[PDB]
Structure formats: structure tokens, C-alpha cells
């Protein structure tokens, strides 16, 4: 009854556009061996450049989570890493034909469908977990991000936009609530005045109502509206779960964020890793007694 590492049963292919680059990209997800982790692979380059999805490999953290190795980058990993986390995938190669993961519909839903379509393969090695033993918190200005010990996995998040479209708080316990049903479909979002400024700096080149909630001063411009009453904060949870997967093992504990984002989330990851008294690596001989 040991909790085992998981990979894909089959290879998966998909096509899309990078949210920032607007470049067409071909994505392939491939099974990987035990103790590989998630590894991104720029197959458009010669020689091929591979970047393990790990906190040490994170570059700038402005408008997405970016992996960097020399002057090669992989942009906007957070939603695909979220999907991997949501289905418990430990080992996979992610092949990209360009610098950015495709945005798809703005959510992790297409990725969770692609992975489940491929099927999961249990491997003959114990899954390793990071268990939080001490509260670890980082703050900067009005923003805060925390890990608290918790016998399971759960994410709480609160946002605070002074905007007519604004609930700005949600908490999900992933042992009793489905990531697939409650979080995976939550789409990225953009305010018209940010979008106007990002374009002018050659960012959000791939953005559209097909892949993002577009908000003007008053309302969602998307014809078919929101998927969740609380879609915005549910998307922040989705982002956080992706960033958390850069720890390189699944977490037993609780993440709380207040106005947090990639920059402060990464600060928290680095602070947790640095304080070895605050965590331990653990395995489970028996899924029937385990905290998740
Ligand atoms: O601004 C964006 N994202 C950042 C937002 C979404 C959230 N971040 C995330 O989802 C992270 C970071 C990437 F967006 C994915 N993962 C948190 N957050 C913010 O806090 C904004 C308010 C400062 C945009 C997303 C799509 C845009 C467009 C567009 C567009 C539409 C029509 C035509 C032309 C172009 S702009
Ligand atoms: Zn996002």
C-alpha cells in the first residue's frame, strides 16, 4: 500500500500560443524515470537545453514563473506545473518547440485533461514528501505568504482589488475537494489598463478573451462571463500550486497567501528550503494511514 512515484503511461502532444511571446508552440509530455522530477526541454535548440522545474532555476518573476539556464529560458510554467501537482505526477519530460509553455484557455483544465487522457503509471519507488514542521512566513509591503504545519495539503488565498468586479478569499483542502473540479478551470485575468501597458513592452502578445478574463474599469468583457463566482482568487490558488511544485517534492502542509504572487511565493520557497529545521522529507509505507 506504499505511496509510489507517478509518471505518464503515454506521450501527449498539444499546440498553443505563449501568453507573453504570442509564439505558436508544440508541447509534448513524456514519461520519465523514478527520481527525475519535472524537466522542461527546449527541442527547438541544438544542442537541446533541459531545465529541471526547481526553485534554484527560477529567473525573473514579474508576469509569470520563468526557468532560466544561461541565456535559455522557459516562460510561464506555473499552470502546467499546477496541473502536474493536481494529478500527483512526480516524473515527466516537457518538450517545447519555443521559449514559452502554451497558455491554452488561461487555465490548467486542458493540461489536466491531456495528462488524464495519457493515463498515469505508478513506479516502483516511494514518493517523497516535504512535511512542514515550523511556520515559515515572508512579508514585503502589504503582501504575505506563509507555510503552516497541517496534516494534509491545503491552500488559502485572499486578494484585494479596489475594482467594481470585486469574493476575494478562498480556502481549499485538496484531500476533501477536487483540484480538477474546484480550481483547474480558473483562468488568468488582465485589467484593460495593464494590457495596454504590457503590449507597449511586447508582453501579453498572445493574450485574448480566448485565453484570459479581460476586465475593464467595471466588468468582465468575456461574452460568456466567469466559470466560478471567485474565479480570480481561484486562479491565484492555481498559480501558487504551480510555484509550490518548484520545491521538487509534494508538500504536506498549508500555504496561505495575502496579495502574494510569483516574486513573494519564490521568496517563501527559498526561505523554506534555507531553514532545514522547518521541514523534513518523508515517505508513506501505507496510503490508508497517510495525511492526504
Ligand atoms: O495581467 C495579466 N496577468 C497577471 C494577473 C493574473 C494573475 N497572474 C497570473 O495568472 C500568472 C501570470 C500570468 F498571467 C499567468 N500566471 C495575477 N495578476 C495580477 O495581479 C495583475 C493585476 C496585476 C494578464 C493575463 C492576460 C493578459 C492579457 C491579454 C489580452 C487580452 C486581449 C487582448 C490582448 C491581450 S494580461
Ligand atoms: Zn496564472
From Swiss-Prot:
Entry annotation: catalytic residues: 262 (proton donor)
Annotated pathway: Glycolipid biosynthesis; lipid IV(A) biosynthesis; lipid IV(A) from (3R)-3-hydroxytetradecanoyl-[acyl-carrier-protein] and UDP-N-acetyl-alpha-D-glucosamine: step 2/6
Catalyzed chemical reaction(s): a UDP-3-O-[(3R)-3-hydroxyacyl]-N-acetyl-alpha-D-glucosamine + H2O = a UDP-3-O-[(3R)-3-hydroxyacyl]-alpha-D-glucosamine + acetate
Stretches assigned to coiled coil: none
Keyword check for Lipid biosynthesis: yes
Binding-site residues for Zn(2+), renumbered to this chain: 79, 235, 239
Official protein name in the record: UDP-3-O-acyl-N-acetylglucosamine deacetylase
Organism: Pseudomonas aeruginosa (strain ATCC 15692 / DSM 22644 / CIP 104116 / JCM 14847 / LMG 12228 / 1C / PRS 101 / PAO1)
Encoding gene, per UniProt annotation: lpxC
Amino acid at each position: 500500500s506504499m505511496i509510489k512515484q507517478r509518471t505518464l503511461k503515454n506521450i501527449i502532444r498539444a499546440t498553443g500560443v505563449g501568453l507573453h511571446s504570442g509564439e505558436k508552440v508544440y508541447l509534448t509530455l513524456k514519461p520519465a524515470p523514478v527520481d527525475t522530477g519535472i524537466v522542461f526541454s527546449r527541442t527547438d535548440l541544438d544542442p537541446v537545453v533541459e531545465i529541471p522545474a526547481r526553485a534554484e532555476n527560477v529567473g525573473e518573476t514579474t508576469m509569470s514563473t520563468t526557468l532560466v539556464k544561461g541565456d535559455v529560458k522557459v516562460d510561464t510554467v506555473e499552470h502546467l506545473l499546477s496541473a502536474m501537482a493536481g494529478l500527483g505526477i512526480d516524473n515527466a519530460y516537457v518538450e517545447l518547440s519555443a521559449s514559452e509553455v502554451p497558455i491554452m484557455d488561461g487555465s490548467a483544465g486542458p493540461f489536466v485533461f491531456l495528462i488524464q487522457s495519457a493515463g498515469l503509471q505508478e513506479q516502483e519507488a516511494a514518493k517523497k514528501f516535504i512535511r512542514i514542521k515550523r511556520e515559515v512566513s515572508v512579508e514585503e509591503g502589504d503582501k504575505r505568504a506563509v507555510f503552516v504545519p497541517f496534516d494534509g495539503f491545503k491552500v488559502s488565498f485572499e486578494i484585494d482589488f479596489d475594482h467594481p468586479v470585486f469574493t476575494q478569499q478562498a480556502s481549499v483542502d485538496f484531500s476533501s475537494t477536487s483540484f480538477v473540479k474546484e480550481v483547474s478551470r480558473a483562468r488568468t485575468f488582465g485589467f484593460m489598463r495593464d494590457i495596454e501597458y504590457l503590449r507597449s513592452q511586447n508582453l501579453a502578445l498572445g493574450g485574448s478573451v480566448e485565453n484570459a478574463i479581460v476586465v475593464d474599469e467595471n466588468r468582465v468583457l468575456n461574452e460568456d462571463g466567469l466559470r466560478y463566482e471567485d474565479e480570480f482568487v481561484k486562479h491565484k490558488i492555481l498559480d501558487a500550486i504551480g510555484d509550490l511544485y518548484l520545491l521538487g517534492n509534494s508538500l504536506i502542509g498549508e500555504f496561505r497567501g495575502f496579495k502574494s504572487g510569483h516574486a513573494l511565493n519564490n521568496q517563501l520557497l527559498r526561505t523554506l528550503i534555507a531553514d532545514k529545521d522547518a521541514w523534513e522529507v518523508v515517505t508513506f509505507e501505507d496510503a490508508r494511514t497517510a495525511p492526504i
